[PDB]
Structure 1
């Protein structure tokens, strides 16, 4: 199937920067997210669909905060819990973590088996966090992803 999402590193003060794409296709097992990203920090990063079609910042306690315009994790079924990509009572936007190599690149595709159709993700955003993802709300909320590092709107 295919949606090419342009992703930018978020910096409300100094300016957002292009870091590449995430291409979304359909497989017989769910949606596949194929990154082609550069310039990110080495490690595993939380990777989720967020509810709003926006990567804009929003104030939080008077601080203009990167990516908050995207809202929370996409949760149309009201799971109200962060979890695993293969967990039915987790947010539907919970994707497998994104791998960024030592050289700052990400090319490894990942499968979201609960997302079945491309139209399901249109009108939302894809977020890449500074932290990782332990697929739980303990010991940190939302898998420990923390701040929003990079984002793209899915059209």
Structure 2
């Protein structure tokens, strides 16, 4: 079983652009997210499951903000803090950082040990940030992910 998520670079002005997919599979140690993306800025990128199954933008203080429609990091256990994928008292949506190579592609799979079944993540969104993820709210909030650069809805 698997879930192929279509991911798009968010552009509230001229329209979202397809950048590939992220395929979710189950392993004996948790859900595995295998990316097949391209056209992205090289480096480490914050990667988390957000609460709403939406990648639409939302007006925030006069600005149509990319991906705000997805809401915050998925936190069904009410951890109320950003952490490591292997930290029990961190948002359940906190996944390992995504690696984008020099050529703008991302194909390295990552494991989210706290997620066990595919049905558990359906009805939410996967977000890729412009910044990275140090898995802490220190010194920057939410791992320093910053703006939402790409997103897909898990169905």
* TM-score (ref. length: structure 2): 1.00
Alpha-carbon shift at residue 109 of structure 1 (Å):
0.1
Alpha-carbon shift at residue 130 of structure 1 (Å):
0.1
> Counterpart of 2:8 in 1: which secondary structure?
strand
Q: Work out the CA distance in 1 between the residues paired with 2:149 and 2:121.
A: 20
Q: Work out the CA distance in 2 between the residues paired with 1:14 and 1:102.
A: 26
Per-residue Cα deviation, 1:12-39 (whole angstroms, up to 9, x for no partner) = 0011100000000000000000000000
* TM-score (ref. length: structure 1): 1.00
Kindly report structure 1 stretches of 4+ aligned residues shifted beyond 3 Å.
Answer: none
> Which runs of no fewer than 5 residues in structure 1 stay unpaired?
none
> Which runs of no fewer than 5 residues in structure 2 stay unpaired?
none
Q: Alignment length, in residue pairs?
A: 155
Aligned to 1:15: 15
Aligned to 2:150: 150
RMSD (Å) for aligned C-alpha atoms: 0.3
> Counterpart of 1:120 in 2: which secondary structure?
helix
Alpha-carbon shift at residue 70 of structure 1 (Å):
0.1
Aligned to 1:107: 107
Q: Work out the CA distance in 1 between the residues paired with 2:119 and 2:90.
A: 20
Per-residue Cα deviation, 1:55-93 (whole angstroms, up to 9, x for no partner) = 000010010000000000000000000000000000000
